[PDB]
From a paper:
To validate the computational modeling design, the analogs were co‐crystallized with importin‐α, and their structures were experimentally determined by X‐ray crystallography. The crystal structures of A1–A4 in complex with mImpα2 at resolutions ranging from 2.11 to 2.42 Å were determined. The electron densities of the 10 ARM domains of mImpα2 without the importin‐β‐binding (IBB)‐domain were clearly resolved including the P1–P6 and P′1–P′5 sites for the major and minor NLS‐binding grooves, respectively. The crystal structures had the same space groups as the original TAF8 NLS/importin‐α complex and every amino acid was resolved for all analogs bound at the major groove. Accordingly, the analogs bury an average surface area of 629.6 ± 21.2 Å2 in the major groove. Superpositioning the four analog structures at the major groove showed that the sequences also share almost identical binding modes, based on the alpha‐carbon's (Cα's) as the crystal structure of TAF8 NLS. The Cα backbone of the analogs exhibited RMSD values of 0.485, 0.529, 0.487, and 0.513 Å for A1, A2, A3, and A4, respectively, at the major groove. The analogs formed a total of 8–10 hydrogen bonds, 1 salt bridge, 37–40 VdW interactions, and 1–2 cation–π bonds. Visual inspection revealed that although the side chains for K299, K300, and K301 residues aligned at the P2, P3, and P4 sites, indicating that the analogs also relied on the consensus sequences for their binding, there were notable spatial orientational differences for some other residues and the amino acid contributions for A1–A4 changed significantly from the computational modeling. Crystal structures of these analogs complexed with mImpα2 confirmed their binding modes, albeit the novel interactions formed in the modeling procedure were disrupted by DTT used during crystallization.
Importin‐α is critical for successful nuclear import as it recognizes and binds to cargo proteins bearing a classical nuclear localization signal (NLS), which facilitates their transport from the cytoplasm into the nucleus. Importin‐α possesses an α‐solenoid tertiary structure characterized by a deep concave surface ideal for NLS‐cargo binding (Fournier et al. 2013). Notably, the twist causes the concave surface to become deeper at the N‐ and C‐termini, resulting in what is commonly known as the major (ARMs 2–4) and minor (ARMs 6–8) NLS‐binding grooves, respectively. In this study, we describe a combined computational and biophysical approach to design TAF8 NLS analogs, with zero net charge, and test their ability to target importin‐α.
Residue numbers in the entry:
A (entry chain A): 72 to 496
B (entry chain C): 1 to 9
C (entry chain B): 1 to 6
Write the structure that this text describes.
């Protein structure tokens, strides 16, 4: 009855004085907007239907038109920013928040979904959803003794919507809204559904993507052990956000970085730094770089966990972007490490793969590598082993490459190049 | 990623 | 030894 209607027909039904006719047309609209090939969102908007759909959200007496309108508006709100704006401009936000209390679960869920699309547009709509008071009713839907009694699809939708309220920067979500949400997020991070876990980790990754104070809010809730556990999961959709969150945390203070180390994170990096997904390797190497930028005792834990050989590994062979992250990890290690730690790094074979990367067509990695050489030489100066290092560099083809670089466009390159040749060679 | 259309029930 | 966010 309600399949493949024209917009013209939907409009005629919706403008009828007949609630049942309006219901059939709203369902027809929903089915249009639910089609996979190019749903006519803009024709629906141009027909002036959004205000009608929004008014139908408020018809408590007619639950089916509430649902059909909810779903229609959800699909419009899933499109461009402009499409989402049209839904918001129609007054949908408060009307969807009212529907969170619906006795009908399918309607409540639709309202959750719609608010998730609205908040996911960006900071401004996210913050407007929050101002209209969405968070209390959302969290009330998860206030049960055991999350396992909720329907799977419902809990997944709620988690996804909450993650969108945690998302975006410039600005980041209000501190009080983050404090309000975090306890429910901690609970979802212990739920056993892979999709709930993935979206919970994504939420934590967003909340840790910022200054130390934002990181502290999360770290203080004691989630880092659970994040490290999830970092060891089989499901890539869990590992990806868990590793991003862990990586975000170690961009903070040395004491925040230590909580990740204390939680056992470094024991997973052998796998992460050899992971077949390029992105996991990249992000794991980035994470390592901000751990090697830490304290000497923190560098020592990297050493004890057997991870220097894995950094030599990624430097020797990886996607280029991973190799650049590894070069950073080495410069940081050499910058902050004791002489013994820097010696160990050479003993593990760092020199040849570093020198092979000086052939790269990237100015930044060259500068990074040259800084690392300088730091290593400085440790050799303190041991009076500058010559053995010079010979090592020379034997693997390094001296050739550094010489060339004395004649490179970038100034800091040729400078650092020249200094090395003239001081050690 | 940020938005999701509902395709059916 | 400076942390670089991403």
């Amino acid at each position: 009855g309600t399949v493949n209607w024209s917009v013209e027909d939907i409009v005629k039904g919706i403008n009828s004085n007949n609630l049942e006719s309006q219901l059939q047309a709203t369902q027809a609209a929903r089915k249009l907007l639910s089609r996979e090939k190019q749903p006519p969102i803009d024709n629906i908007i141009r027909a002036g239907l959004i205000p009608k759909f929004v008014s139908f959200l408020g018809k408590t007496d007619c639950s089916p038109i509430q649902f059909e309108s909810a779903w229609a508006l959800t699909n419009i709100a899933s499109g461009t920013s402009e499409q989402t704006k049209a839904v918001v401009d129609g007054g949908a936000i408060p009307a969807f928040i009212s529907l969170l209390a619906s006795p009908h679960a399918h309607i409540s869920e639709q309202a959750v979904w719609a608010l998730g699309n609205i908040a996911g547009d960006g900071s401004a709509f996210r913050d407007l959803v929050i101002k209209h008071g969405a968070i209390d009713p959302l969290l009330a839907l998860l206030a049960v003794p055991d999350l396992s009694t909720l329907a799977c699809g419902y809990l997944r939708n709620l988690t996804w919507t909450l993650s969108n309220l945690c998302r975006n920067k410039n600005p980041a979500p209000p501190l009080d809204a983050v404090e309000q949400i975090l306890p429910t997020l901690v609970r979802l991070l212990h739920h056993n559904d892979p999709e709930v876990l993935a979206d919970s980790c994504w939420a934590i990754s967003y909340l840790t993507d910022g200054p130390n104070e934002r990181i502290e809010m999360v770290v203080k809730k004691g989630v880092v052990p659970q994040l490290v556990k999830l970092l060891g999961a089989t499901e890539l959709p869990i590992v990806t956000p868990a590793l991003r969150a862990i990586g975000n945390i170690v961009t903070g203070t040395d004491e925040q970085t230590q909580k990740v180390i204390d939680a056992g994170a470094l024991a997973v990096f052998p796998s992460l730094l050899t992971n077949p997904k390029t992105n996991i390797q990249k992000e794991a190497t980035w994470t390592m770089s901000n751990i090697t930028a830490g304290r000497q005792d923190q560098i020592q834990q990297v050493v004890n966990h057997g991870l220097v050989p894995f950094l030599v590994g990624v430097l020797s062979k990886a996607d280029f972007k991973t190799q650049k992250e590894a070069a950073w990890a080495i410069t940081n290690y050499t910058s902050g490490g004791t002489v013994e730690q820097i010696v160990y790094l050479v003993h593990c074979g760092i020199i040849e793969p570093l020198m092979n990367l000086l052939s790269a067509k990237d100015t930044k990695i060259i500068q990074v590598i040259l800084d690392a050489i300088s730091n290593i030489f400085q440790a050799a100066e303190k041991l009076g082993e500058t010559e053995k290092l010079s010979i090592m560099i020379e034997e693997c083809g390094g001296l050739d490459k550094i010489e060339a670089l004395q004649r490179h466009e970038n100034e800091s390159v040729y400078k650092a190049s020249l200094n090395l040749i003239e001081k050690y060679f | 990623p940020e938005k999701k259309p509902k395709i059916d029930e």
